[PDB]
Amino acid sequence: QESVKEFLAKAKEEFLKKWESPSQNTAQLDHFDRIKTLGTGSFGRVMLVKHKETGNHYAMKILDKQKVVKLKQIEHTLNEKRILQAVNFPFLVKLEFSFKDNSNLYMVMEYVPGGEMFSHLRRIGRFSEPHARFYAAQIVLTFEYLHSLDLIYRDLKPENLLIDQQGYIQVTDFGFAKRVKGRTWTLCGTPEYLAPEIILSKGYNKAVDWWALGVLIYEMAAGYPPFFADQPIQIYEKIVSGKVRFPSHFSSDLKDLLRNLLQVDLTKRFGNLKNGVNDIKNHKWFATTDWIAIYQRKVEAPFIPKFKGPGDTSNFDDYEEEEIRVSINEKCGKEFTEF
Numbered sequence: 001q002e003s004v005k006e007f008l009a010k011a012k013e014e015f016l017k018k019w020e021s022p023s024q025n026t027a028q029l030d031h032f033d034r035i036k037t038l039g040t041g042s043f044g045r046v047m048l049v050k051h052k053e054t055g056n057h058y059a060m061k062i063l064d065k066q067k068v069v070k071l072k073q074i075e076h077t078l079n080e081k082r083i084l085q086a087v088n089f090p091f092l093v094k095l096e097f098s099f100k101d102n103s104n105l106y107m108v109m110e111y112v113p114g115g116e117m118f119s120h121l122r123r124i125g126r127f128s129e130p131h132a133r134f135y136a137a138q139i140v141l142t143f144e145y146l147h148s149l150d151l152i153y154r155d156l157k158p159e160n161l162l163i164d165q166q167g168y169i170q171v172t173d174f175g176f177a178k179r180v181k182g183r184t185w186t187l188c189g190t191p192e193y194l195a196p197e198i199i200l201s202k203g204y205n206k207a208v209d210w211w212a213l214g215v216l217i218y219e220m221a222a223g224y225p226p227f228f229a230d231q232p233i234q235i236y237e238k239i240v241s242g243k244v245r246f247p248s249h250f251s252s253d254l255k256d257l258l259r260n261l262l263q264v265d266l267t268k269r270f271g272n273l274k275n276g277v278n279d280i281k282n283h284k285w286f287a288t289t290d291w292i293a294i295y296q297r298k299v300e301a302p303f304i305p306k307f308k309g310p311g312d313t314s315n316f317d318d319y320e321e322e323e324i325r326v327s328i329n330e331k332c333g334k335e336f337t338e339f
């Protein structure tokens with residue numbers, strides 16, 4: 001309908017204005033108190049912090065510039081911040097501040113206290129089809145938005161989907177997201193979710209995000225992913241074969257949608273045909289979904305996470321607490337000039 005077309009046209013206008021003139025240097029480290037490490041990886045970490053003047057809580061992602069360079073992530077970290085400061089959608093975590101110093105890059109996001117979807121999935125075992133479908137509809141709308149801005153997300157998995165105070169999803173981690181007209185070539189993403197054309201080192205497009213939504217819906221409704229194996233090479237052989245086995249408890253409508261999203265031939269995959277996202281939105285598995293009501297946040301969620309207030313960390317796990325050290329000398333200034 002024209003209403004959807006005009007919504008996506010305005011979304012692209014507003015994105016391009018911020019894309020062409022990015023904000024920079026909007027806070028500094030000593031405006032915040034450090035509370036707790038919420039997650040740690042090979043070149044960065046995420047910390048709960050409190051702003052000292054307002055008392056508001058935020059999630060601060062800290063990237064070590066020297067490790068970014070060594071792990072070949074310069075372009076990816078510049079993509080992440082430039083895209084996050086330009087997007088606006090109900091199911092995307094909001095960037096509030098960004099800045100850099102002699103040692104680190106910082107992105108200060110809204111803090112979502114209910115934790116990762118992955119923790120709730122593993123606690124309950126699997127989600128019922130109605131519960132899986134409520135989350136899946138939020139991902140379909142978010143990919144419709146991102147793809148219309150020529151963005152590919154490239155890191156869909158349950159650890160990157162946080163559950164908010166109303167039980168809705170907020171997508172975090174734009175470290176692999178990129179603006180792409182046509183094809184792109186980088187090998188990136190988590191093994192269990194990679195589409196075959198990425199594993200085969202082909203030039204690929206937004207169809208890899210719709211493959212990864214098939215893997216996500218399978219894992220939500222089964223409790224484990226479709227292509228599981230002990231080592232990555234074994235996973236990759238299963239993926240490129242595309243042989244999938246479905247639990248008997250899956251509905252016939254869920255199996256049919258999954259066979260069309262987990263289609264090895266990218267030119268036959270739902271989301272990448274002439275009708276685009278509408279082949280997914282109009283599939284029988286989504287017949288009960290009110291797409292406008294989901295966007296408007298008017299549907300009652302399947303569950304609300306248990307937490308005590310905006311500073312509660314009980315839905316995230318425990319990590320060794322390390323210093324946030326800042327060198328007396330500037331590192332890698334040229335590489336990160338635009339940040």
Ligand SMILES: O=C(c1cncnc1)N1CC[C@H](c2nc3ccccc3o2)C1
Pocket residue numbers: 038039040041044045046047059093109110111112113162172173316
């Ligand atoms: O704490 C938040 C959170 C994020 N955004 C808003 N609210 C909360 N985590 C913690 C776990 C997750 C996470 N992602 C990471 C990426 C790189 C390195 C470490 C990471 O740990 C998101």
